[PDB]
Design a protein around this ligand. Structure first.
Ligand SMILES: CC(C)CCCCCCC[C@@H](C)CCC[C@@H](C)CCO[C@H](CO)COCC[C@@H](C)CCC[C@H](C)CCC[C@@H](C)CCCC(C)C
Ligand SMILES: CC(C)CCCCCCC[C@@H](C)CCC[C@@H](C)CCO[C@H](CO)COCC[C@@H](C)CCC[C@H](C)CCC[C@@H](C)CCCC(C)C
Ligand SMILES: CC(C)CCCCCCC[C@@H](C)CCC[C@@H](C)CCO[C@H](CO)COCC[C@@H](C)CCC[C@H](C)CCC[C@@H](C)CCCC(C)C
Ligand SMILES: CC(C)CCCCCCC[C@@H](C)CCC[C@@H](C)CCO[C@H](CO)COCC[C@@H](C)CCC[C@H](C)CCC[C@@H](C)CCCC(C)C
Ligand SMILES: CC(C)CCCCCCC[C@@H](C)CCC[C@@H](C)CCO[C@H](CO)COCC[C@@H](C)CCC[C@H](C)CCC[C@@H](C)CCCC(C)C
Ligand SMILES: CC(C)CCCCCCC[C@@H](C)CCC[C@@H](C)CCO[C@H](CO)COCC[C@@H](C)CCC[C@H](C)CCC[C@@H](C)CCCC(C)C
Ligand SMILES: CC(C)CCCCCCC[C@@H](C)CCC[C@@H](C)CCO[C@H](CO)COCC[C@@H](C)CCC[C@H](C)CCC[C@@H](C)CCCC(C)C
Ligand SMILES: CC(C)CCCCCCC[C@@H](C)CCC[C@@H](C)CCO[C@H](CO)COCC[C@@H](C)CCC[C@H](C)CCC[C@@H](C)CCCC(C)C
Ligand SMILES: CC(C)CCCCCCC[C@@H](C)CCC[C@@H](C)CCO[C@H](CO)COCC[C@@H](C)CCC[C@H](C)CCC[C@@H](C)CCCC(C)C
Ligand SMILES: CC(C)CCCCCCC[C@@H](C)CCC[C@@H](C)CCO[C@H](CO)COCC[C@@H](C)CCC[C@H](C)CCC[C@@H](C)CCCC(C)C
Ligand SMILES: CC(C)CCCCCCC[C@@H](C)CCC[C@@H](C)CCO[C@H](CO)COCC[C@@H](C)CCC[C@H](C)CCC[C@@H](C)CCCC(C)C
Ligand SMILES: CC(C)CCCCCCCCCCCC[C@@H](C)CCCCCCCC(C)C
Ligand SMILES: CC(C)CCCCCCCCCCCC[C@@H](C)CCCCCCCC(C)C
Ligand SMILES: CC(C)CCCCCCCCCCCC[C@@H](C)CCCCCCCC(C)C
Ligand SMILES: *C\C=C(C)/C=C/C=C(C)/C=C/C1=C(C)CCCC1(C)C
Ligand SMILES: *C\C=C(C)/C=C/C=C(C)/C=C/C1=C(C)CCCC1(C)C
Ligand SMILES: *C\C=C(C)/C=C/C=C(C)/C=C/C1=C(C)CCCC1(C)C
Lengths: 222, 222, 222
C-alpha cells in the first residue's frame, strides 16, 4: 500500500505468524507442568504480536497524533502488543528463577507503568511532554532491568539460561527507548518506515528469537 | 425506545440481574474454599453481564461503525462483557479439572485473543477484513475448544460434571461465531434485533444457565 | 495554568511521587517473601497514582463530557488510577488475613465493577443515568466493605493491623461516592476544583497514608 512501512508490518506479521505456528507445533506433546508454562507463554507472545502486527498492517492499530503542528502516525497497537507480551516475557524469567511473587508483582506493575506511560507519551499532543513520559517509562524500564540484573541457588542450567536471556533482555529492551526517541514517535530523527523496521526487528527478536533460545534449554523442564 | 433490540437488552439486563442476585444469595453460607471459588466466578460473571447489558440498554455500550457505506450499530459492550466473563468461565472448567497453570494461561491468553480480535473485527471499517478477524478469532476459539475437549483421574463427579459443562461449552461457544457471521456484525443476513436476541439468549444461557448447572454439582465442593 | 484545580493535581503529583520514592527506598533490603509482597503493592500503588496524577496535571487524563447541556471536564484518569490501585489495596488486606482465593476474586471482581461502573457513570451523557451507575458502583462498594468488615485465627498483630486498616478503609473508601455525588461529576453541588482537592486528599490518604500505616506494622513480615 501507500504506507512505506507496510512491508515491515507485513514481514513482521508473517514472522510472528510463523513463530506462533512453530511454537504451537513444537509445544505438542509437552506434558511437564513446568515446561508447559514456558511453552504457553512463549507461544502466546508471538500469537498476540501476530494479531497486533496484522492490525498495524491492515491499518487498524494506527492512529494520527497532532504535535509539532504535524499529523503523526502513531501505531498504538505496538503498545497494546507490548502491554501484554512484556509481562509474559518477564513471567518467563521469573518462573525461570522461581522469583518471589512480590518481586513478580513489582516487575509486572513496573512493566505496565513502562508501557502505559510510553503509550501516553506516544499519544501526548504537547511535544515536550512526550519526553517526560519517555523519561518516566525509561525509569520504569531501568527499574525492571535493575531487578532482573541484580535481583534475579538455582541449578546451573537455570542460572546459565537465565544469564543468557537476561543479557539478551537488557540489550534488547534497552534498544526500544532509543528507537522511540530517535524515531518519528519522539525526536523525528529517523523516519517512521525506518522506525517501524527497527521495532519489527526488535519485536521478532524479542518475541520469536528470545523464545527460540528459551525453548532450546532444558532449564524449562522441571 | 427507538432501538427495536431494546427489549432483548432489557430482558437480558433483568435476567443477568436476577441471576446475580440468585447466586449472591445462593452463595451465602458457603465456607468451603473450593466451593467459594466457583461461587465467586459464577456470581461475578452475570454481575458483569448485568452491568454490560445495562450499558447496552441505556445506549452507552454501543458505537456506530462505517462499512458497506452504512452506519452499523456495534454493541462494543458485548465484547467487553465477554472479555471478562469468558476467561472466568474457563476458570470454572480449569479449577474443575485442576488444570495445569500453563494450560490455564494458554486458555486465558487464547481467549483474550479470541475476544480481542472479535472486537477488532467488530470495529473494523473495511468490510472484508472484518472476516479476517472473525476467522482468527474463530481459530482461537477452536484452539480453546480443542484444549477443553481433548486436554481437559478426577473423581467421577468431577469428570461427570466436567463432561456436561464441556459439551455445553462447545455447543454454546460455537454458536457465537455463527451469530456474528450471519448477524449485522458480519454478513448482515440477520438483522440487529434478531442478532441481539440471539446473543442475549446465548449470554443468559452461558452466564446464568451454565452457572445453574455448575452450582448444582457437588463437584464444586472439595 | 488556567485550570484552577491544577495546584491540587500538582500537589497530588508531588506527594504520590514523594511517597513512591519513600517506599522505594524503604523497601530496599527487604528479603522476607511476605514483606516483599506488601512492599511491592504499597510502592506500586502511589507509583501508578503518580503517573495518573501527572497525566491529569498535564491535561492528558482529562476529557469533556456533555450533560446538563454543559461541557463537563471529567478526569477519566482518576478512574484508571483507581482501577489498578484499588484491587492492589484489597490485595494488601487479603494477604494480611490470608483470604481465600475465591474471596479475593470476589473482591477484585466487585472492585472492577465498582470502578468500571463509576467510570461509565462519569462518562455517561444522560444526566439521570449517571446516578444509576453511581448507585450500582456504590452497591459494589458496599459489597466490598461488607466482605472486608464481616468476612475478613490470625496472629494478634495481623488481626490488630487488619482492624486498623479495615476501619481506615471503610471511612476512606466510603468518602469517594460522596465526593463524586456532590462534586462536578455528579450533582454539581461542589465545584471541580474543590472536588479535585477532595479526591486528591483521599487519594494521598489511601495511597500514601494507608501504606505508611501498613508498612509500619510487623504484620507484613512472616
Ligand atoms: C497498572 C498496573 C499500570 C498503570 C499504568 C500507568 C499509565 C496508565 C496509562 C493509561 C492510558 C490509557 C489510554 C487511554 C485510556 C487514553 C484515552 O484517550 C487517549 C488520548 O487522550 C486516546 O487517544 C486516541 C486513542 C488511541 C488508542 C489507544 C488504545 C490503547 C489500547 C491499550 C489497551 C489494549 C486494549 C486490549 C483490549 C482487548
Ligand atoms: C531527568 C528529567 C526529569 C527527565 C525528563 C526530561 C524532560 C524531557 C525534555 C523535553 C524538553 C526539555 C525538550 C522539548 C523539545 C525541545 C528540544 C525543542 C522544543 O520544540 C521543538 C522545536 O519547536 C519541537 O520540534 C522538534 C525538535 C526535536 C527534534 C528536539 C526534541 C528533543 C526531545 C528531548 C530529548 C530528551 C533526551 C534527548 C534526553 C535524554 C535524557
Ligand atoms: C524527581 C524529578 C522531578 C523534578 C521536578 C521538576 C519540576 C518541574 O518543572 C516545573 C517548572 O516550574 C514545571 O513547569 C513546567 C510546566 C509543566 C509541568 C511539568 C511538571 C512535570 C514535568 C513533572 C516532572 C516529573 C517527570 C518525571 C520524570 C521521570 C522521573 C521518574 C525521574
Ligand atoms: C540492539 C542494537 C541494535 C545493537 C547495539 C549493541 C548491542 C549490544 C550487545 C552487546 C551487549 C552484550 C551484553 C554483555 C555480554 C556478556 C554478558 O554476560 C554476563 C556475564 O554473566 C551476564 O550478565 C551481564 C549483563 C549484560 C547485559 C548488558 C547489555 C548492555 C546493553 C547495551 C545497550 C545497547 C545500546 C542500544 C542499541 C542502539 C539501538 C541504541
Ligand atoms: C492479551 C492476553 C490479549 C491480546 C489481544 C489481541 C487483540 C488486542 C485487541 C486490541 C483492541 C483494543 C481496542 C481499542 C484499543 C481500539 C481503539 O480504536 C478503536 C477503533 O480503531 C475504537 O473505535 C471506537 C471505540 C469503541 C470502544 C471500544 C472499547 C472496548 C473496551 C474493551 C476493554 C474493556 C474496558 C474495561 C475498563 C473498565
Ligand atoms: C482460511 C482463511 C484465511 C480464513 C479467512 C477468510 C477471509 C474472509 C473472506 C472475506 C472476503 C473474502 C469476502 C468479502 C465480502 C465479499 C463476499 C463481498 C465483497 O463486498 C460485499 C459486496 O460489496 C459487501 O457487501 C456485503 C456482502 C456480504 C453479505 C458477503 C460477505 C461474506 C463474508 C465472508 C464470510 C466468510 C465465511 C462465510 C467463510 C467461512 C470460512
Ligand atoms: C496461514 C493463512 C494465511 C494465508 C496467507 C494469505 C496471504 C494474504 O493475501 C495477500 C494477497 O497478496 C494479501 O493481499 C490482500 C491485502 C490485505 C492484506 C491481507 C493479509 C492478511 C489477510 C493476512 C491473512 C492472515 C489472516 C489470518 C486468518 C486466520 C489464520 C490464523 C488461520
Ligand atoms: C445452539 C444452537 C441454537 C442449537 C443448535 C444445535 C445445538 C447443539 C446441541 C447438540 C450437541 C450436543 C453435544 C453432544 C452430546 C453428547 C456429548 O457428550 C460427550 C460424551 O462424553 C462428552 O463430550 C462430547 C463433546 C460434544 C460437544 C460437541 C457439541 C457440538 C456443537 C454443535 C454446534 C452447534 C451449531 C451452531 C448452532 C447454530 C446457531 C449455528
Ligand atoms: C471485570 C472484572 C470488570 C467488569 C467491568 C464492568 C464495567 C465495564 C466498564 C467498561 C467501560 C469501558 C470504557 C470505554 C470502553 C468506553 C468507550 O467509549 C466511552 C464513551 O462511550 C469513552 O468516551 C471517551 C473516552 C474516555 C477515556 C476512557 C478511558 C478509560 C481507560 C481505563 C482503562 C485504563 C487503560 C490502561 C491501559 C494502559
Ligand atoms: C435504589 C435505586 C435503584 C438507586 C438508583 C437511583 C437512580 C438515581 C436517581 C437519579 C434521577 C432519579 C434524578 C435525575 C436528576 C433529577 C434530580 C433532576 C433532573 O434533571 C436535573 C434538572 O434538569 C439536571 O440538573 C441537575 C440537578 C441535580 C443537582 C440533581 C440531580 C440529583 C441526582 C440524584 C442523586 C441520587 C442520590 C441523592 C440518592 C442517594 C440514594
Ligand atoms: C473522611 C471524611 C472527610 C471525614 C468524615 C468522618 C470520618 C469518619 C472517621 C470516624 C469513623 C472511625 C471508624 C470507627 C472507629 C473504631 C473502629 O474500630 C473497630 C473496633 O474493632 C474495628 O472495625 C470497625 C469498623 C469501623 C469502620 C466504619 C467507618 C464509618 C465510615 C464513616 C463514613 C464517613 C462519611 C463520609 C465522609 C464525608 C466526606 C461524606
Ligand atoms: C531453533 C530453530 C528451529 C530455529 C528456526 C526459527 C523459525 C521460526 C520462524 C521464523 C523466525 C524466527 C527466526 C529468529 C531470528 C530473529 C532474531 C530475527 C530474524 C528476522 C528476519 C528474517 C530472517 C530470519 C529468519 C530465520 C526468518
Ligand atoms: C436451579 C434453579 C433454582 C433454577 C432457577 C433459575 C433462576 C434464575 C434467574 C432467571 C434466569 C435463569 C434461567 C436459566 C435458563 C436459560 C438457559 C435461558 C432462559 C432465558 C429466558 C427467560 C425464560 C427462563 C427463565 C427461567 C427466566
Ligand atoms: C512514617 C513516616 C516516615 C512518615 C512520613 C511520610 C512521607 C511521605 C511522603 C509525603 C506524604 C505522606 C504523608 C501522609 C499523610 C496524608 C494522610 C495526607 C497529607 C497530604 C498533604 C500534605 C501534608 C502532609 C505531609 C506529611 C506531606
Ligand atoms: C515486544 C517485546 C518487548 C521486549 C518490547 C519491549 C518494550 C520496551 C522495553 C519499551 C520501552 C519504552 C520505553 C522505556 C520508553 C519509550 C516507550 C517504550 C514503551 C518504547
Ligand atoms: C458470555 C459468555 C460467553 C460464553 C461468550 C462466548 C463468546 C465467544 C465464544 C465469542 C466468539 C467469537 C468468535 C469466534 C468470532 C466472532 C467474534 C466472537 C467474539 C463473537
Ligand atoms: C485510590 C484509592 C482508592 C481507595 C479509591 C477508592 C475508590 C472508590 C471506593 C470509588 C468509588 C466510587 C463509587 C462507589 C461510586 C462513584 C464512583 C466511584 C468510582 C468514585
Amino acid at each position: 500500500t501507500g504506507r512505506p512501512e507496510w512491508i515491515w508490518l507485513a514481514l513482521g506479521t508473517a514472522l510472528m505468524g510463523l513463530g506462533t505456528l512453530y511454537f504451537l507445533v513444537k509445544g505438542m506433546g509437552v506434558s511437564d507442568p513446568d515446561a508447559k508454562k514456558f511453552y504457553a507463554i512463549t507461544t502466546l507472545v508471538p500469537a498476540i504480536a501476530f494479531t497486533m502486527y496484522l492490525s498495524m498492517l491492515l491499518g487498524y492499530g494506527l492512529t494520527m497524533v497532532p504535535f509539532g503542528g504535524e499529523q503523526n502516525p502513531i501505531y498504538w497497537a505496538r503498545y497494546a502488543d507490548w502491554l501484554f507480551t512484556t509481562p509474559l516475557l518477564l513471567l518467563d524469567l521469573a518462573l525461570l528463577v522461581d522469583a518471589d511473587q512480590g518481586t513478580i508483582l513489582a516487575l509486572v506493575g513496573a512493566d505496565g507503568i513502562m508501557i502505559g506511560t510510553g503509550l501516553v507519551g506516544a499519544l501526548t499532543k504537547v511535544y515536550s511532554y512526550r519526553f517526560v513520559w519517555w523519561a518516566i517509562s525509561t525509569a520504569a524500564m531501568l527499574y525492571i532491568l535493575y531487578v532482573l540484573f541484580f535481583g534475579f541457588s538455582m541449578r546451573p542450567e537455570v542460572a546459565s539460561t537465565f544469564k543468557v536471556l537476561r543479557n539478551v533482555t537488557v540489550v534488547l529492551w534497552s534498544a526500544y527507548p532509543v528507537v522511540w526517541l530517535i524515531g518519528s514517535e519522539g525526536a523525528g530523527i529517523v523516519p517512521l518506515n525506518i522506525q517501524t523496521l527497527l521495532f519489527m526487528v526488535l519485536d521478532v527478536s524479542a518475541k520469536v528469537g528470545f523464545g527460540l533460545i528459551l525453548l532450546r534449554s532444558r532449564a524449562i523442564f522441571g
